[PDB]
């Protein structure tokens, strides 16, 4: 009785094993192989966060759970998930090619990053659509952003509330909430890219929902291209805010990220933690969504809303 649809789930991608680090970072760096010292540093970082293998598993579990939950909560469509990645196989084009091979003619896509940008989301969507056009007989409707889905806001609001509730009384009254996403080159401004505005809006919505009056917006994980990147960086922001007002606790909500990957487990849980430890403040960073039912229901709602269902 049901219509078949592809569910194209897109993400940055992560190495599968240590021996993938070289090719994965070469791809990120646009063909420039990391030097030996950098390769070694990267391996050490992954070791420090508990290893590589669990990383790509999260993305897989998110796609699987999303597929199953979508199929459970409505009776009109049967979805089949395909994963399409930017920096490692299966590439976006591979996923579209497989949908076509499997006889999918209608699909909906979503990127596992809640804010629209020209650099990432728009590029992924365009790439998916271009391959579908090349192959023919398959159309894709694409989710562009989802940071403002109420169920998603509620996820983080509730995690934040729990974190503040857990604090000793003196911290609860002298904390700062830092809401962040992956930095991008400032030059996206030239195109009117709403990415920064959307991060600020995520921050406002989460702080408001949680009843937190003192918060700030920062960026993290900037690449090394010569042109300026969006700032301030969370490490600098933390110290600046401390020097300015003396906060006893910092709560990090990397809302731009959806899982326990290197840019949270290392860029927050290590790099930010260095700074909080140095200044004598308490470090908190509530659970990432990962593949938890609350987050999966949020994504499901996003997809069904995009289809008018
Ligand atoms: Fe299942
Ligand atoms: Fe379910
Ligand atoms: Fe700002
Ligand atoms: Fe990055
Ligand atoms: Mg090995
Ligand atoms: Mg929208
Ligand atoms: Mg970095």
PDB file of C-alpha atoms and ligand atoms in Angstrom:
ATOM      1  CA  UNK A   1       0.000   0.000   0.000  1.00  0.00           C
ATOM      2  CA  UNK A   2       2.962   2.367   0.568  1.00  0.00           C
ATOM      3  CA  UNK A   3       5.073   4.644  -1.635  1.00  0.00           C
ATOM      4  CA  UNK A   4       8.824   3.829  -1.616  1.00  0.00           C
ATOM      5  CA  UNK A   5      11.232   6.726  -0.938  1.00  0.00           C
ATOM      6  CA  UNK A   6      14.979   7.109  -0.546  1.00  0.00           C
ATOM      7  CA  UNK A   7      16.159   8.827   2.613  1.00  0.00           C
ATOM      8  CA  UNK A   8      19.508  10.396   1.716  1.00  0.00           C
ATOM      9  CA  UNK A   9      21.442  11.145   4.918  1.00  0.00           C
ATOM     10  CA  UNK A  10      24.514  13.314   4.392  1.00  0.00           C
ATOM     11  CA  UNK A  11      27.469  14.136   6.601  1.00  0.00           C
ATOM     12  CA  UNK A  12      31.120  15.164   6.627  1.00  0.00           C
ATOM     13  CA  UNK A  13      32.328  11.571   7.114  1.00  0.00           C
ATOM     14  CA  UNK A  14      34.938  10.131   9.475  1.00  0.00           C
ATOM     15  CA  UNK A  15      37.847   7.668   9.140  1.00  0.00           C
ATOM     16  CA  UNK A  16      36.923   3.964   9.700  1.00  0.00           C
ATOM     17  CA  UNK A  17      40.339   2.949  11.057  1.00  0.00           C
ATOM     18  CA  UNK A  18      43.646   4.604  11.941  1.00  0.00           C
ATOM     19  CA  UNK A  19      45.104   3.780   8.523  1.00  0.00           C
ATOM     20  CA  UNK A  20      42.390   6.000   6.942  1.00  0.00           C
ATOM     21  CA  UNK A  21      43.587   9.194   8.648  1.00  0.00           C
ATOM     22  CA  UNK A  22      46.064  10.027   5.882  1.00  0.00           C
ATOM     23  CA  UNK A  23      43.534   9.860   2.975  1.00  0.00           C
ATOM     24  CA  UNK A  24      40.752  11.457   5.005  1.00  0.00           C
ATOM     25  CA  UNK A  25      42.828  14.523   5.932  1.00  0.00           C
ATOM     26  CA  UNK A  26      44.361  14.731   2.456  1.00  0.00           C
ATOM     27  CA  UNK A  27      40.794  15.013   1.140  1.00  0.00           C
ATOM     28  CA  UNK A  28      39.868  17.691   3.719  1.00  0.00           C
ATOM     29  CA  UNK A  29      43.057  19.606   2.832  1.00  0.00           C
ATOM     30  CA  UNK A  30      42.155  19.572  -0.902  1.00  0.00           C
ATOM     31  CA  UNK A  31      44.900  17.164  -2.041  1.00  0.00           C
ATOM     32  CA  UNK A  32      47.644  18.306   0.345  1.00  0.00           C
ATOM     33  CA  UNK A  33      49.013  15.288   2.241  1.00  0.00           C
ATOM     34  CA  UNK A  34      49.679  16.038   5.905  1.00  0.00           C
ATOM     35  CA  UNK A  35      53.348  15.971   6.904  1.00  0.00           C
ATOM     36  CA  UNK A  36      54.596  13.052   9.083  1.00  0.00           C
ATOM     37  CA  UNK A  37      54.546  15.109  12.303  1.00  0.00           C
ATOM     38  CA  UNK A  38      50.902  16.073  11.639  1.00  0.00           C
ATOM     39  CA  UNK A  39      49.875  12.472  10.813  1.00  0.00           C
ATOM     40  CA  UNK A  40      51.354  11.344  14.137  1.00  0.00           C
ATOM     41  CA  UNK A  41      49.633  14.173  16.057  1.00  0.00           C
ATOM     42  CA  UNK A  42      46.271  13.218  14.511  1.00  0.00           C
ATOM     43  CA  UNK A  43      46.681   9.560  15.473  1.00  0.00           C
ATOM     44  CA  UNK A  44      47.492  10.609  19.043  1.00  0.00           C
ATOM     45  CA  UNK A  45      44.362  12.795  19.152  1.00  0.00           C
ATOM     46  CA  UNK A  46      42.154   9.925  18.070  1.00  0.00           C
ATOM     47  CA  UNK A  47      43.784   7.623  20.633  1.00  0.00           C
ATOM     48  CA  UNK A  48      43.093  10.273  23.310  1.00  0.00           C
ATOM     49  CA  UNK A  49      39.363  10.390  22.546  1.00  0.00           C
ATOM     50  CA  UNK A  50      38.901   6.561  22.823  1.00  0.00           C
ATOM     51  CA  UNK A  51      39.694   5.538  19.244  1.00  0.00           C
ATOM     52  CA  UNK A  52      38.362   5.872  15.700  1.00  0.00           C
ATOM     53  CA  UNK A  53      36.043   2.873  15.236  1.00  0.00           C
ATOM     54  CA  UNK A  54      33.091   4.222  17.293  1.00  0.00           C
ATOM     55  CA  UNK A  55      33.067   7.463  15.230  1.00  0.00           C
ATOM     56  CA  UNK A  56      31.539   6.311  11.866  1.00  0.00           C
ATOM     57  CA  UNK A  57      29.283   3.925  13.784  1.00  0.00           C
ATOM     58  CA  UNK A  58      27.334   6.859  15.192  1.00  0.00           C
ATOM     59  CA  UNK A  59      26.455   8.157  11.705  1.00  0.00           C
ATOM     60  CA  UNK A  60      25.385   4.653  10.669  1.00  0.00           C
ATOM     61  CA  UNK A  61      23.206   4.254  13.760  1.00  0.00           C
ATOM     62  CA  UNK A  62      21.636   7.699  13.201  1.00  0.00           C
ATOM     63  CA  UNK A  63      20.690   6.780   9.600  1.00  0.00           C
ATOM     64  CA  UNK A  64      19.360   3.329  10.660  1.00  0.00           C
ATOM     65  CA  UNK A  65      17.332   4.572  13.623  1.00  0.00           C
ATOM     66  CA  UNK A  66      15.945   7.432  11.521  1.00  0.00           C
ATOM     67  CA  UNK A  67      14.853   4.992   8.768  1.00  0.00           C
ATOM     68  CA  UNK A  68      13.159   2.656  11.248  1.00  0.00           C
ATOM     69  CA  UNK A  69      11.467   5.393  13.253  1.00  0.00           C
ATOM     70  CA  UNK A  70      10.128   7.160  10.136  1.00  0.00           C
ATOM     71  CA  UNK A  71       8.696   3.827   8.994  1.00  0.00           C
ATOM     72  CA  UNK A  72       7.066   3.239  12.378  1.00  0.00           C
ATOM     73  CA  UNK A  73       5.425   6.667  12.991  1.00  0.00           C
ATOM     74  CA  UNK A  74       3.524   6.936   9.723  1.00  0.00           C
ATOM     75  CA  UNK A  75       1.904   4.508   7.303  1.00  0.00           C
ATOM     76  CA  UNK A  76       2.088   6.173   3.885  1.00  0.00           C
ATOM     77  CA  UNK A  77       5.783   5.898   2.922  1.00  0.00           C
ATOM     78  CA  UNK A  78       8.478   3.233   3.271  1.00  0.00           C
ATOM     79  CA  UNK A  79      11.902   4.863   3.556  1.00  0.00           C
ATOM     80  CA  UNK A  80      15.258   3.277   2.778  1.00  0.00           C
ATOM     81  CA  UNK A  81      18.318   5.099   4.140  1.00  0.00           C
ATOM     82  CA  UNK A  82      21.439   5.786   2.110  1.00  0.00           C
ATOM     83  CA  UNK A  83      24.504   7.492   3.622  1.00  0.00           C
ATOM     84  CA  UNK A  84      26.397  10.021   1.454  1.00  0.00           C
ATOM     85  CA  UNK A  85      29.582  11.626   2.800  1.00  0.00           C
ATOM     86  CA  UNK A  86      31.873  14.521   1.819  1.00  0.00           C
ATOM     87  CA  UNK A  87      35.353  13.306   2.718  1.00  0.00           C
ATOM     88  CA  UNK A  88      35.339   9.484   2.561  1.00  0.00           C
ATOM     89  CA  UNK A  89      33.403   6.659   0.903  1.00  0.00           C
ATOM     90  CA  UNK A  90      30.499   6.256   0.503  1.00  0.00           C
ATOM     91  CA  UNK A  91      30.565   9.623  -1.285  1.00  0.00           C
ATOM     92  CA  UNK A  92      27.360  11.641  -1.934  1.00  0.00           C
ATOM     93  CA  UNK A  93      27.509  10.624  -5.613  1.00  0.00           C
ATOM     94  CA  UNK A  94      27.946   6.911  -4.694  1.00  0.00           C
ATOM     95  CA  UNK A  95      24.792   7.058  -2.530  1.00  0.00           C
ATOM     96  CA  UNK A  96      22.711   8.713  -5.255  1.00  0.00           C
ATOM     97  CA  UNK A  97      24.049   6.134  -7.752  1.00  0.00           C
ATOM     98  CA  UNK A  98      22.984   3.303  -5.454  1.00  0.00           C
ATOM     99  CA  UNK A  99      19.483   4.715  -4.921  1.00  0.00           C
ATOM    100  CA  UNK A 100      19.138   4.812  -8.707  1.00  0.00           C
ATOM    101  CA  UNK A 101      20.432   1.249  -9.052  1.00  0.00           C
ATOM    102  CA  UNK A 102      17.952   0.038  -6.404  1.00  0.00           C
ATOM    103  CA  UNK A 103      15.041   1.567  -8.349  1.00  0.00           C
ATOM    104  CA  UNK A 104      14.377   4.574  -6.090  1.00  0.00           C
ATOM    105  CA  UNK A 105      12.708   7.360  -8.096  1.00  0.00           C
ATOM    106  CA  UNK A 106      11.788   9.724  -5.250  1.00  0.00           C
ATOM    107  CA  UNK A 107      13.955  10.783  -2.323  1.00  0.00           C
ATOM    108  CA  UNK A 108      14.283  13.234   0.528  1.00  0.00           C
ATOM    109  CA  UNK A 109      17.675  14.315   1.881  1.00  0.00           C
ATOM    110  CA  UNK A 110      18.856  15.768   5.173  1.00  0.00           C
ATOM    111  CA  UNK A 111      22.320  16.854   6.292  1.00  0.00           C
ATOM    112  CA  UNK A 112      23.483  15.919   9.776  1.00  0.00           C
ATOM    113  CA  UNK A 113      24.296  19.574  10.588  1.00  0.00           C
ATOM    114  CA  UNK A 114      21.351  21.763  11.705  1.00  0.00           C
ATOM    115  CA  UNK A 115      22.390  25.133  10.196  1.00  0.00           C
ATOM    116  CA  UNK A 116      22.391  26.031   6.515  1.00  0.00           C
ATOM    117  CA  UNK A 117      25.619  27.202   4.917  1.00  0.00           C
ATOM    118  CA  UNK A 118      26.731  27.802   1.335  1.00  0.00           C
ATOM    119  CA  UNK A 119      29.992  25.988   2.112  1.00  0.00           C
ATOM    120  CA  UNK A 120      28.542  22.730   3.369  1.00  0.00           C
ATOM    121  CA  UNK A 121      24.748  22.104   3.214  1.00  0.00           C
ATOM    122  CA  UNK A 122      24.172  23.940  -0.048  1.00  0.00           C
ATOM    123  CA  UNK A 123      27.135  22.163  -1.682  1.00  0.00           C
ATOM    124  CA  UNK A 124      25.951  18.710  -0.508  1.00  0.00           C
ATOM    125  CA  UNK A 125      22.387  19.338  -1.746  1.00  0.00           C
ATOM    126  CA  UNK A 126      23.585  20.632  -5.104  1.00  0.00           C
ATOM    127  CA  UNK A 127      25.910  17.625  -5.504  1.00  0.00           C
ATOM    128  CA  UNK A 128      23.092  15.125  -4.729  1.00  0.00           C
ATOM    129  CA  UNK A 129      20.746  16.848  -7.189  1.00  0.00           C
ATOM    130  CA  UNK A 130      23.424  17.015  -9.909  1.00  0.00           C
ATOM    131  CA  UNK A 131      24.130  13.291  -9.758  1.00  0.00           C
ATOM    132  CA  UNK A 132      20.406  12.525  -9.783  1.00  0.00           C
ATOM    133  CA  UNK A 133      20.049  14.736 -12.912  1.00  0.00           C
ATOM    134  CA  UNK A 134      23.018  13.007 -14.531  1.00  0.00           C
ATOM    135  CA  UNK A 135      21.456   9.570 -13.929  1.00  0.00           C
ATOM    136  CA  UNK A 136      17.904  10.732 -14.630  1.00  0.00           C
ATOM    137  CA  UNK A 137      14.548   9.363 -13.482  1.00  0.00           C
ATOM    138  CA  UNK A 138      15.143  10.247  -9.808  1.00  0.00           C
ATOM    139  CA  UNK A 139      14.269  13.453  -7.950  1.00  0.00           C
ATOM    140  CA  UNK A 140      15.422  14.686  -4.540  1.00  0.00           C
ATOM    141  CA  UNK A 141      13.777  17.193  -2.216  1.00  0.00           C
ATOM    142  CA  UNK A 142      16.375  18.546   0.219  1.00  0.00           C
ATOM    143  CA  UNK A 143      16.103  19.803   3.824  1.00  0.00           C
ATOM    144  CA  UNK A 144      18.187  23.018   4.012  1.00  0.00           C
ATOM    145  CA  UNK A 145      18.196  23.702   7.746  1.00  0.00           C
ATOM    146  CA  UNK A 146      16.528  22.330  10.851  1.00  0.00           C
ATOM    147  CA  UNK A 147      18.098  24.194  13.814  1.00  0.00           C
ATOM    148  CA  UNK A 148      14.672  25.692  14.621  1.00  0.00           C
ATOM    149  CA  UNK A 149      12.700  22.425  14.810  1.00  0.00           C
ATOM    150  CA  UNK A 150      11.108  22.701  18.286  1.00  0.00           C
ATOM    151  CA  UNK A 151      11.895  19.086  19.196  1.00  0.00           C
ATOM    152  CA  UNK A 152      15.601  19.737  18.489  1.00  0.00           C
ATOM    153  CA  UNK A 153      15.667  22.974  20.500  1.00  0.00           C
ATOM    154  CA  UNK A 154      13.959  21.062  23.334  1.00  0.00           C
ATOM    155  CA  UNK A 155      16.671  18.344  23.251  1.00  0.00           C
ATOM    156  CA  UNK A 156      19.353  20.930  24.074  1.00  0.00           C
ATOM    157  CA  UNK A 157      17.193  23.031  26.383  1.00  0.00           C
ATOM    158  CA  UNK A 158      16.555  19.958  28.529  1.00  0.00           C
ATOM    159  CA  UNK A 159      20.233  18.904  28.537  1.00  0.00           C
ATOM    160  CA  UNK A 160      21.217  22.466  29.534  1.00  0.00           C
ATOM    161  CA  UNK A 161      18.611  22.575  32.345  1.00  0.00           C
ATOM    162  CA  UNK A 162      19.963  19.302  33.758  1.00  0.00           C
ATOM    163  CA  UNK A 163      23.507  20.607  33.662  1.00  0.00           C
ATOM    164  CA  UNK A 164      22.651  23.830  35.525  1.00  0.00           C
ATOM    165  CA  UNK A 165      20.529  21.834  38.012  1.00  0.00           C
ATOM    166  CA  UNK A 166      23.570  19.603  38.733  1.00  0.00           C
ATOM    167  CA  UNK A 167      25.868  22.530  39.595  1.00  0.00           C
ATOM    168  CA  UNK A 168      26.753  23.575  43.124  1.00  0.00           C
ATOM    169  CA  UNK A 169      24.900  26.751  44.140  1.00  0.00           C
ATOM    170  CA  UNK A 170      27.940  29.044  43.674  1.00  0.00           C
ATOM    171  CA  UNK A 171      28.494  27.803  40.090  1.00  0.00           C
ATOM    172  CA  UNK A 172      24.806  28.000  39.191  1.00  0.00           C
ATOM    173  CA  UNK A 173      24.949  31.758  39.900  1.00  0.00           C
ATOM    174  CA  UNK A 174      28.277  32.427  38.151  1.00  0.00           C
ATOM    175  CA  UNK A 175      28.214  30.252  34.988  1.00  0.00           C
ATOM    176  CA  UNK A 176      28.553  31.100  31.303  1.00  0.00           C
ATOM    177  CA  UNK A 177      26.901  29.077  28.516  1.00  0.00           C
ATOM    178  CA  UNK A 178      28.909  28.989  25.266  1.00  0.00           C
ATOM    179  CA  UNK A 179      26.920  27.862  22.194  1.00  0.00           C
ATOM    180  CA  UNK A 180      29.096  26.954  19.166  1.00  0.00           C
ATOM    181  CA  UNK A 181      29.364  25.486  15.678  1.00  0.00           C
ATOM    182  CA  UNK A 182      32.107  24.644  13.188  1.00  0.00           C
ATOM    183  CA  UNK A 183      33.834  27.826  12.015  1.00  0.00           C
ATOM    184  CA  UNK A 184      33.761  28.707   8.286  1.00  0.00           C
ATOM    185  CA  UNK A 185      35.694  31.239   6.194  1.00  0.00           C
ATOM    186  CA  UNK A 186      34.418  34.767   6.823  1.00  0.00           C
ATOM    187  CA  UNK A 187      34.079  35.155   3.038  1.00  0.00           C
ATOM    188  CA  UNK A 188      30.701  33.348   3.121  1.00  0.00           C
ATOM    189  CA  UNK A 189      29.459  36.857   4.121  1.00  0.00           C
ATOM    190  CA  UNK A 190      29.879  37.897   0.455  1.00  0.00           C
ATOM    191  CA  UNK A 191      26.977  35.586  -0.470  1.00  0.00           C
ATOM    192  CA  UNK A 192      24.721  36.653   2.457  1.00  0.00           C
ATOM    193  CA  UNK A 193      25.175  33.220   4.024  1.00  0.00           C
ATOM    194  CA  UNK A 194      22.778  32.906   6.995  1.00  0.00           C
ATOM    195  CA  UNK A 195      25.065  30.420   8.828  1.00  0.00           C
ATOM    196  CA  UNK A 196      26.215  32.900  11.544  1.00  0.00           C
ATOM    197  CA  UNK A 197      22.696  34.269  12.008  1.00  0.00           C
ATOM    198  CA  UNK A 198      21.357  30.721  12.427  1.00  0.00           C
ATOM    199  CA  UNK A 199      23.965  29.833  15.062  1.00  0.00           C
ATOM    200  CA  UNK A 200      22.990  33.022  17.005  1.00  0.00           C
ATOM    201  CA  UNK A 201      19.337  32.028  16.730  1.00  0.00           C
ATOM    202  CA  UNK A 202      20.070  28.459  17.990  1.00  0.00           C
ATOM    203  CA  UNK A 203      21.875  30.124  20.941  1.00  0.00           C
ATOM    204  CA  UNK A 204      18.989  32.491  21.721  1.00  0.00           C
ATOM    205  CA  UNK A 205      16.399  29.676  21.503  1.00  0.00           C
ATOM    206  CA  UNK A 206      18.379  27.285  23.730  1.00  0.00           C
ATOM    207  CA  UNK A 207      19.288  29.903  26.385  1.00  0.00           C
ATOM    208  CA  UNK A 208      15.706  31.206  26.419  1.00  0.00           C
ATOM    209  CA  UNK A 209      14.231  27.698  26.726  1.00  0.00           C
ATOM    210  CA  UNK A 210      16.600  26.763  29.546  1.00  0.00           C
ATOM    211  CA  UNK A 211      16.164  30.102  31.370  1.00  0.00           C
ATOM    212  CA  UNK A 212      19.856  30.991  31.107  1.00  0.00           C
ATOM    213  CA  UNK A 213      20.420  34.757  30.963  1.00  0.00           C
ATOM    214  CA  UNK A 214      24.222  34.760  30.474  1.00  0.00           C
ATOM    215  CA  UNK A 215      25.413  33.163  27.279  1.00  0.00           C
ATOM    216  CA  UNK A 216      27.742  33.769  24.360  1.00  0.00           C
ATOM    217  CA  UNK A 217      28.184  32.541  20.792  1.00  0.00           C
ATOM    218  CA  UNK A 218      31.513  31.158  19.597  1.00  0.00           C
ATOM    219  CA  UNK A 219      33.027  29.144  16.748  1.00  0.00           C
ATOM    220  CA  UNK A 220      35.380  26.152  16.849  1.00  0.00           C
ATOM    221  CA  UNK A 221      37.515  23.882  14.694  1.00  0.00           C
ATOM    222  CA  UNK A 222      38.513  26.418  12.002  1.00  0.00           C
ATOM    223  CA  UNK A 223      40.659  24.997   9.180  1.00  0.00           C
ATOM    224  CA  UNK A 224      43.981  26.452   7.991  1.00  0.00           C
ATOM    225  CA  UNK A 225      43.172  28.381   4.846  1.00  0.00           C
ATOM    226  CA  UNK A 226      44.947  31.789   4.652  1.00  0.00           C
ATOM    227  CA  UNK A 227      41.692  33.792   4.527  1.00  0.00           C
ATOM    228  CA  UNK A 228      40.102  34.758   7.886  1.00  0.00           C
ATOM    229  CA  UNK A 229      37.689  32.341   9.603  1.00  0.00           C
ATOM    230  CA  UNK A 230      34.623  33.133  11.695  1.00  0.00           C
ATOM    231  CA  UNK A 231      35.475  33.919  15.319  1.00  0.00           C
ATOM    232  CA  UNK A 232      35.950  34.269  18.146  1.00  0.00           C
ATOM    233  CA  UNK A 233      37.249  30.744  18.669  1.00  0.00           C
ATOM    234  CA  UNK A 234      35.777  29.044  21.780  1.00  0.00           C
ATOM    235  CA  UNK A 235      39.233  28.826  23.426  1.00  0.00           C
ATOM    236  CA  UNK A 236      39.808  32.593  23.139  1.00  0.00           C
ATOM    237  CA  UNK A 237      36.179  33.408  23.990  1.00  0.00           C
ATOM    238  CA  UNK A 238      36.376  31.364  27.212  1.00  0.00           C
ATOM    239  CA  UNK A 239      39.489  33.196  28.449  1.00  0.00           C
ATOM    240  CA  UNK A 240      38.149  36.630  27.387  1.00  0.00           C
ATOM    241  CA  UNK A 241      34.852  36.080  29.213  1.00  0.00           C
ATOM    242  CA  UNK A 242      36.738  34.868  32.291  1.00  0.00           C
ATOM    243  CA  UNK A 243      39.091  37.895  32.272  1.00  0.00           C
ATOM    244  CA  UNK A 244      36.036  40.133  31.802  1.00  0.00           C
ATOM    245  CA  UNK A 245      33.666  38.741  34.499  1.00  0.00           C
ATOM    246  CA  UNK A 246      35.260  35.797  36.373  1.00  0.00           C
ATOM    247  CA  UNK A 247      32.832  32.937  35.636  1.00  0.00           C
ATOM    248  CA  UNK A 248      33.296  29.830  37.810  1.00  0.00           C
ATOM    249  CA  UNK A 249      31.826  27.349  35.329  1.00  0.00           C
ATOM    250  CA  UNK A 250      31.555  27.115  31.548  1.00  0.00           C
ATOM    251  CA  UNK A 251      28.909  24.981  29.814  1.00  0.00           C
ATOM    252  CA  UNK A 252      29.639  24.118  26.162  1.00  0.00           C
ATOM    253  CA  UNK A 253      26.787  23.376  23.783  1.00  0.00           C
ATOM    254  CA  UNK A 254      28.363  22.602  20.354  1.00  0.00           C
ATOM    255  CA  UNK A 255      24.934  22.723  18.743  1.00  0.00           C
ATOM    256  CA  UNK A 256      26.393  22.676  15.186  1.00  0.00           C
ATOM    257  CA  UNK A 257      27.579  19.080  15.791  1.00  0.00           C
ATOM    258  CA  UNK A 258      25.299  16.045  16.212  1.00  0.00           C
ATOM    259  CA  UNK A 259      27.683  13.369  17.549  1.00  0.00           C
ATOM    260  CA  UNK A 260      30.700  12.385  19.687  1.00  0.00           C
ATOM    261  CA  UNK A 261      33.353  13.067  16.984  1.00  0.00           C
ATOM    262  CA  UNK A 262      36.853  14.589  17.153  1.00  0.00           C
ATOM    263  CA  UNK A 263      35.621  18.172  17.034  1.00  0.00           C
ATOM    264  CA  UNK A 264      33.651  17.706  20.269  1.00  0.00           C
ATOM    265  CA  UNK A 265      35.621  15.050  22.158  1.00  0.00           C
ATOM    266  CA  UNK A 266      38.899  16.831  21.419  1.00  0.00           C
ATOM    267  CA  UNK A 267      38.105  20.434  20.411  1.00  0.00           C
ATOM    268  CA  UNK A 268      35.743  20.865  23.393  1.00  0.00           C
ATOM    269  CA  UNK A 269      36.465  18.115  25.937  1.00  0.00           C
ATOM    270  CA  UNK A 270      40.255  18.585  25.624  1.00  0.00           C
ATOM    271  CA  UNK A 271      41.000  22.060  24.149  1.00  0.00           C
ATOM    272  CA  UNK A 272      38.302  23.988  26.021  1.00  0.00           C
ATOM    273  CA  UNK A 273      38.999  21.893  29.181  1.00  0.00           C
ATOM    274  CA  UNK A 274      42.685  22.999  29.055  1.00  0.00           C
ATOM    275  CA  UNK A 275      41.509  26.622  29.297  1.00  0.00           C
ATOM    276  CA  UNK A 276      38.899  26.046  32.040  1.00  0.00           C
ATOM    277  CA  UNK A 277      41.478  24.035  34.013  1.00  0.00           C
ATOM    278  CA  UNK A 278      44.011  26.870  33.597  1.00  0.00           C
ATOM    279  CA  UNK A 279      41.614  29.557  34.847  1.00  0.00           C
ATOM    280  CA  UNK A 280      40.252  27.350  37.690  1.00  0.00           C
ATOM    281  CA  UNK A 281      36.677  27.024  36.350  1.00  0.00           C
ATOM    282  CA  UNK A 282      34.452  23.903  36.152  1.00  0.00           C
ATOM    283  CA  UNK A 283      33.949  22.349  32.698  1.00  0.00           C
ATOM    284  CA  UNK A 284      30.580  21.013  31.517  1.00  0.00           C
ATOM    285  CA  UNK A 285      29.557  19.762  28.080  1.00  0.00           C
ATOM    286  CA  UNK A 286      26.193  17.932  28.006  1.00  0.00           C
ATOM    287  CA  UNK A 287      25.556  14.791  25.912  1.00  0.00           C
ATOM    288  CA  UNK A 288      25.598  15.131  22.129  1.00  0.00           C
ATOM    289  CA  UNK A 289      22.383  13.933  20.405  1.00  0.00           C
ATOM    290  CA  UNK A 290      24.117  10.866  18.802  1.00  0.00           C
ATOM    291  CA  UNK A 291      21.429   8.242  17.969  1.00  0.00           C
ATOM    292  CA  UNK A 292      19.158   8.788  21.010  1.00  0.00           C
ATOM    293  CA  UNK A 293      15.383   8.406  20.485  1.00  0.00           C
ATOM    294  CA  UNK A 294      14.611  12.051  21.357  1.00  0.00           C
ATOM    295  CA  UNK A 295      16.959  13.253  18.602  1.00  0.00           C
ATOM    296  CA  UNK A 296      15.755  10.648  16.101  1.00  0.00           C
ATOM    297  CA  UNK A 297      12.118  11.801  16.632  1.00  0.00           C
ATOM    298  CA  UNK A 298      13.269  15.388  16.032  1.00  0.00           C
ATOM    299  CA  UNK A 299      14.886  14.405  12.698  1.00  0.00           C
ATOM    300  CA  UNK A 300      11.823  12.387  11.729  1.00  0.00           C
ATOM    301  CA  UNK A 301       9.586  15.389  12.281  1.00  0.00           C
ATOM    302  CA  UNK A 302      11.926  17.560  10.182  1.00  0.00           C
ATOM    303  CA  UNK A 303      11.731  15.092   7.290  1.00  0.00           C
ATOM    304  CA  UNK A 304       7.954  14.637   7.428  1.00  0.00           C
ATOM    305  CA  UNK A 305       7.388  18.404   7.697  1.00  0.00           C
ATOM    306  CA  UNK A 306       9.526  18.893   4.555  1.00  0.00           C
ATOM    307  CA  UNK A 307       7.185  16.449   2.751  1.00  0.00           C
ATOM    308  CA  UNK A 308       4.068  18.244   4.082  1.00  0.00           C
ATOM    309  CA  UNK A 309       3.110  15.181   6.136  1.00  0.00           C
TER     310      UNK A 309
HETATM  311 FE1  LIG B   1      16.278  -0.758  14.974  1.00  0.00          FE
HETATM  312 FE1  LIG B   2      10.738   4.704  17.182  1.00  0.00          FE
HETATM  313 FE1  LIG B   3      27.616  37.427  18.126  1.00  0.00          FE
HETATM  314 FE1  LIG B   4      36.580  20.446  10.468  1.00  0.00          FE
HETATM  315 MG1  LIG B   5      45.588  -1.489  12.073  1.00  0.00          MG
HETATM  316 MG1  LIG B   6      13.522  26.706   7.713  1.00  0.00          MG
HETATM  317 MG1  LIG B   7      41.710  22.959  15.808  1.00  0.00          MG
END
